[PDB]
Amino acid sequence: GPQEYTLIKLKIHLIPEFLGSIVKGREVFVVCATLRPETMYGQTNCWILPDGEYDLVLAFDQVIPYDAKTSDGVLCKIFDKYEDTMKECNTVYICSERSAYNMAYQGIVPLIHGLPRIVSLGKVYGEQLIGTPLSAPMTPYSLIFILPMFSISMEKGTGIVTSVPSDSPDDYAALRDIKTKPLLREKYSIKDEWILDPLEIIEVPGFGFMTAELLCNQYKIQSQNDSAKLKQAKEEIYKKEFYEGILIRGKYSGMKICDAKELIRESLIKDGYALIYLE
Amino acid sequence: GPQEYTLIKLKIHLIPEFLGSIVKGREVFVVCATLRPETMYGQTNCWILPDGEYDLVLAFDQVIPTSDGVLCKIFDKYEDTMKECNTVYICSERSAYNMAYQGIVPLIHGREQGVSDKLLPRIVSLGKVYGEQLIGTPLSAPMTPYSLIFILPMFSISMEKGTGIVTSVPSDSPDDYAALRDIKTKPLLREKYSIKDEWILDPLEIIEVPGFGFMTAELLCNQYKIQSQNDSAKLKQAKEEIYKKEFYEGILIRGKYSGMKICDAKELIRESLIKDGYALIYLE
Ligand SMILES: CCC[C@H](N)C(=O)N[C@@H]1[C@H](O)[C@@H](CO)O[C@H]1n1cnc2c(N)ncnc21
Ligand SMILES: CCC[C@H](N)C(=O)N[C@@H]1[C@H](O)[C@@H](CO)O[C@H]1n1cnc2c(N)ncnc21
Ligand SMILES: [K+]
């Protein structure tokens, strides 16, 4: 059965020149599926697969919100032609085609009678979005950048992911690879100013405030591509932090993750910074 | 743009035996797309393609009676459908998807099979049947005075159009007249599909057309030298003359709007069929 994600919306702060005519002064969001909305205080950057192909998809300005935990289905919405969508759709999401169809079949983006089709304004490689500044929710850094991550799967989520390197071993590893490998930075023209240090957001009694760093050392993870080791560190950190982790930032500071998580998810959804996304 | 049909509901009077367990506890309808709801007073039979494959499709009991978008519920599981759906429609799979995408039949959460795990909604099909196996099914059809009409074979049906199942008003459709005549004049065709004489009902006088009278379809078939339901070029012309002529000059002589011009009564008849639950608005 489907997994419930929180779809995090990250607004593009400066549209790249080459996308200007295509987005026609609509708001553009990069969207990222996460199981851990409580960690959004720690965002340092955003991650994209360089060779991955993403769509710029037309989306609803408003989505009908629902109690997914006490309901028997979900609604979608189909139009005759593109021009009919324009009253309700002035928002663009960057995401994989795969995920855009999943979104269409739960009322996040429109379908049209084109077998029904999404409204794709164009395609882009992730490489072409590297260095794009994004306005991000909750993180006190506020403005963060898109960086390359090579371990991403285009078959999961949107193909674009948040980075919380304090409390995700994958994120820690990927960031450390960027910080320690000049040739990688040279290859993708990564500017020094795009790289932000981890933030102390979660206290784990025993481990302190950089649990992901300690777990990377405990499993001797050397790169973002040590998948076997990273898979284990990821599952341990999730269990370790869901029970023992105390938030030390934001409205629910001093609470445990298990107690605050749902409240944070609600808040994100009511403020418009995130959506419920099932795939 | 898409054209606005009226989807007519023909209630199955007695379910064919082989489908009885499948549709137990549910009202079953054959559904037919028509541009001519005003002619349902003259229904003599129903038409199906023998080789065609039709689905038994679970349907909403209630539907939402511009150029906005149209909502659609995708249900988590088959089971959830059950409470707002005790209705089955017989129709082509193609037409059922069209119906699903305008809120007429439920969709259910599904996935692309084998390689992919991507969300792909499905109609709730209860079974696939050939048209041949429904020949002779008795139907309770709206507006016609015939208490029962029957499903008969027609060979000129296109499976891409409407539901693949069509109404028969042989007094005012040249196609219907020609197909019915083929059955009435070919014993070997009746033997081939085991057609009983009591399934073959006569045209009903329903519309008076200046210069033609009450059997305009027969007179057009004579005029265009139509001898067979397969005379597609002649039939298409005849159909194009009869549509305009009847809309603006044809006078209804049956129903509540007897005495009125078709152009003045058609929408009122269509509203009434919809309110009474005998039909739905169907775009394709
Ligand atoms: C802990 C906060 C920061 C962290 N980065 C996070 O939220 N990761 C996503 C999520 O928490 C996890 C679920 O398995 O996988 C990640 N994920 C989602 N989509 C993908 C994808 N397409 N490819 C690889 N990983 C993914
Ligand atoms: C005058 C009433 C009786 C008349 N018989 C009627 O209602 N015909 C349908 C409709 O009015 C017409 C639209 O062109 O095609 C017919 N039609 C609908 N579906 C199909 C199909 N699948 N194949 C061939 N014709 C079709
Ligand atoms: K009747």
Numbering used by the authors:
A (entry chain A): 254 to 367, 377 to 541
B (entry chain D): 254 to 318, 323 to 541
What did the study's authors say about this model?
AARSs play an essential role in protein synthesis by charging tRNAs with their cognate amino acids. Similar to other LeuRSs, the C. muris LeuRS contains a predicted editing domain exhibiting highly conserved motifs that are important for the hydrolysis of tRNALeu mischarged with noncognate amino acids, such as isoleucine or norvaline, while excluding cognate Leu-tRNALeu. The structures show the typical seven-β-strand and three-α-helix fold of the LeuRS connective polypeptide domain (CP1), plus archaeon/eukaryote-specific insertions, denoted I1ae, I2ae, I3ae, and I4ae.
Calorimetric titrations yielded dissociation constants (Kds) of 213 and 215 μM for Nva2AA and Ile2AA, respectively, over the range of affinities observed for bacterial LeuRS, but they were lower than those seen for other editing tRNA synthetases, such as class II threonine-tRNA synthetase (ThrRS). These data, together with the conservation of important active-site residues, suggest that CmLeuRS preserves posttransfer editing activity. The posttransfer editing substrate analogues Nva2AA and Ile2AA can be unambiguously placed at the editing site of CmLeuRS. As was observed for bacterial and fungal LeuRSs, the aliphatic part of the amino acid binds into the hydrophobic pocket formed by residues T292 and V426, while the amino group interacts with the universally conserved aspartic acid (D433); the adenine base is accommodated by residues of the GTG loop (I414, S415, V423, and K418). In our structures, a water molecule is well positioned for promoting hydrolysis (3 to 4 Å to the carbon alpha atom) and is coordinated by a eukaryote-specific lysine (K496). The interactions of the catalytic water and K496 at the editing site of CmLeuRS are strikingly similar to the situation in the ThrRS-Ser3AA complex, which suggests that K496 could have a similar role in hydrolysis by eukaryotic LeuRS. Compared to the structure of the CmLeuRS-AN6426-AMP complex, the posttransfer analogues retain 3 to 4 extra water molecules (depending on the monomer chain) and a phosphate (CmLeuRS-Ile2AA complex), which mediate polar interactions between the compounds and protein residues.
